[PDB]
């Protein structure tokens, strides 16, 4: 991989955006917002191809001069939605100069919905079949964009895959040059190769080779030692609902502290649940004998 980074808030100016330069996974959310003096020229040579996954949500608000995300996040494949912004895993709001999304590698939003609103230049929305990305599209809120108040000339590559929406077959794409990838039904959420060969049952969205859990772009369940696993086996603990960590790691976060991390139900979690207390030294949550101190 690249690097597992914490959740970030990037505002006012682009200088801090270079902090993403080595992340392949954002273990948290990604907020890019309130950049009023930015112009397209400031984004021309700006790219984060390392980014494959965001465990929580992606929020974009009032970023001036940004016209597409095709160059910014070309390989973002999965938004897990472990933690959501107002029940959304993707939020594009008041992005005044955004013309298209262009997240041509986005295959799955594992939990949560989409909110794309008040983006007056935004097209290539009608060309996205969200049913292939989220199970819950009924809760999507996609309104007040260029497509609503004017006639977008959404020209797809021509050629491009075509899917149905209320009896009408429509070609699906992210930009004028990028189609929406669609896999055979049998591949389910696992993804497939260009040739149509299904990825391993433990993959999510895509893989470098078929039927191999060490060749996944992202995991359906848990990640451990470069492999997509179904469960974190003992002595490993499930962490952030996506990876396996050892006792040592979980202990060093507890002592670094933020949250003083604990062990409960084979998970390394921020706090003991209600009715439980932290048994000192072994970090294990044990039930309270009467009320909790």
């Amino acid at each position, epitope marked *: 991989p690249g690097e597992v980074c914490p959740g970030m808030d990037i505002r006012n100016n682009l200088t801090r955006l270079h902090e993403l330069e080595n992340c392949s996974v954002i273990e948290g959310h990604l907020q890019i917002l309130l950049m009023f003096k930015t112009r397209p020229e400031d984004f021309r040579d700006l790219s984060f191809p390392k980014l494959i996954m965001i465990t929580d949500y992606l929020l974009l608000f009032r970023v001036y001069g940004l016209e597409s995300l095709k160059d910014l996040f070309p390989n973002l494949t999965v938004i897990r939605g472990s933690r959501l912004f107002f029940n959304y895993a993707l939020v594009i709001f008041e992005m005044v100069h955004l013309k298209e999304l262009g997240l041509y590698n986005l295959m799955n939003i594992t939990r949560g919905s989409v909110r794309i609103e008040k983006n007056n230049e935004l097209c290539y929305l009608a060309t996205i079949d969200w049913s292939r990305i989220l199970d819950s599209v009924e809760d999507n809120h996609i309104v007040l964009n260029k497509d609503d108040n004017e006639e977008c000339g959404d020209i797809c590559p021509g050629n491009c895959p075509a899917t149905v929406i209320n009896g009408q077959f429509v070609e699906r794409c992210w930009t004028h040059s990028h189609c929406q990838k669609v896999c055979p039904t049998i591949c389910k959420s696992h993804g497939c190769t260009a040739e149509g060969l299904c990825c391993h049952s*433990e993959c999510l969205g895509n893989c470098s080779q078929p039927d191999d*859990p*060490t060749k996944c772009v992202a995991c359906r369940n*848990f990640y*451990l*030692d*470069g*492999r997509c*696993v*179904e*469960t*974190c*086996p*003992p*002595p*490993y603990y*499930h962490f952030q609902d996506w990876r*396996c960590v*050892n006792f040592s790691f979980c202990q060093d976060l507890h002592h670094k502290c933020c949250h003083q991390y604990v062990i409960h*139900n*084979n*998970k390394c979690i921020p706090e003991c649940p209600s009715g439980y207390t932290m048994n000192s030294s072994n970090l294990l949550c044990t039930p309270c004998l009467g009320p909790c101190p």
Partner: antibody, heavy 118, light 115 residues
Framework: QVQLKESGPGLVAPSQSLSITCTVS????????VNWVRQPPGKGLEWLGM???????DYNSALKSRLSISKDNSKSQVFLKMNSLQTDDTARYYC????????????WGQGTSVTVSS | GSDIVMSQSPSSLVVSVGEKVTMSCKSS????????????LAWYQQKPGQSPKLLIY???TRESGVPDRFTGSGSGTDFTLTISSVKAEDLAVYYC????????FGGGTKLEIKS
């Protein structure tokens, strides 16, 4: 396309140390675990030890005192080393892959017959 | 704590072709993982003069390329391997195993067939 192959002595003098090399193919030793399981003549399978992708080792409590498991990921090999052998250590030694977190030992080696004698 | 002890019953059994067969497995502790509500238990078939073959994992999930006649049952501390209609090719030794914490095999069940 997964293969595991044990290379061992056949014959060991008692009190001497036994050294077996399991050479794996078709998968990365950094993602998979490898076990050592032995089987005395006409007896059942005995789990000896295991080595996780991250290099961590786990040994059979009865034999921990005499066992050593190591590996070379680059050479795709795992090494078992057993000290001060006796006649009851005469068995067929197998190395098997552990897809830990998904399946138990799935692919096994054909074995290595190890005899302790005169 | 104290390492996981595995039992099997019977040690050996002699059955005719086409007969149903059920062999037992006991664990000293629960193999039931809270996280996924699955048991860390395996069944292996070892034919004479061959290395073992995984039949069952997760106490009831049939391994790839395992005939339908092989059925793994149970939860926590008790498990059973069932062969609905024994075939001549089933002559083998069957071993249960924990992979909950480390691995421990039960002393096997030798299944013999009447000619």
């Amino acid at each position: 396309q997964v293969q595991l192959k044990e290379s061992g002595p056949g014959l060991v003098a008692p009190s001497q140390s036994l050294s077996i090399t399991c050479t794996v193919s078709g998968f990365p030793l950094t993602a998979y675990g490898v076990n050592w399981v032995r089987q005395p003549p006409g007896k059942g399978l005995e789990w000896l030890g295991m080595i996780w992708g991250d290099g961590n080792t786990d040994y059979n409590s009865a034999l921990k005192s005499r066992l050593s498991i190591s590996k070379d990921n680059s050479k795709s090999q795992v090494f078992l080393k057993m000290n001060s052998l006796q006649t009851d250590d005469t068995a067929r030694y197998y190395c098997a892959r552990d897809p830990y977190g998904s399946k138990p030992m799935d692919y096994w080696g054909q074995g290595t017959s190890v005899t302790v004698s005169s | 704590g104290s390492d996981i002890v595995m039992s099997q019953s019977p040690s050996s059994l002699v059955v005719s072709v086409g007969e149903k067969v059920t062999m037992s497995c006991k664990s000293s502790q629960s193999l039931l993982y809270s996280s996924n509500q699955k048991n860390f238990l395996a069944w292996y078939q070892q034919k004479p003069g061959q290395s073992p073959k995984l039949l069952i994992y997760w106490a009831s999930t049939r391994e790839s390329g395992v005939p339908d006649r092989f059925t793994g049952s149970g939860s926590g501390t008790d498990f059973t391997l069932t062969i609905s209609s024994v075939k001549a090719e089933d002559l083998a030794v069957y071993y249960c195993q924990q992979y909950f914490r480390y691995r421990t095999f039960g002393g096997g069940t030798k299944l013999e067939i009447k000619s």
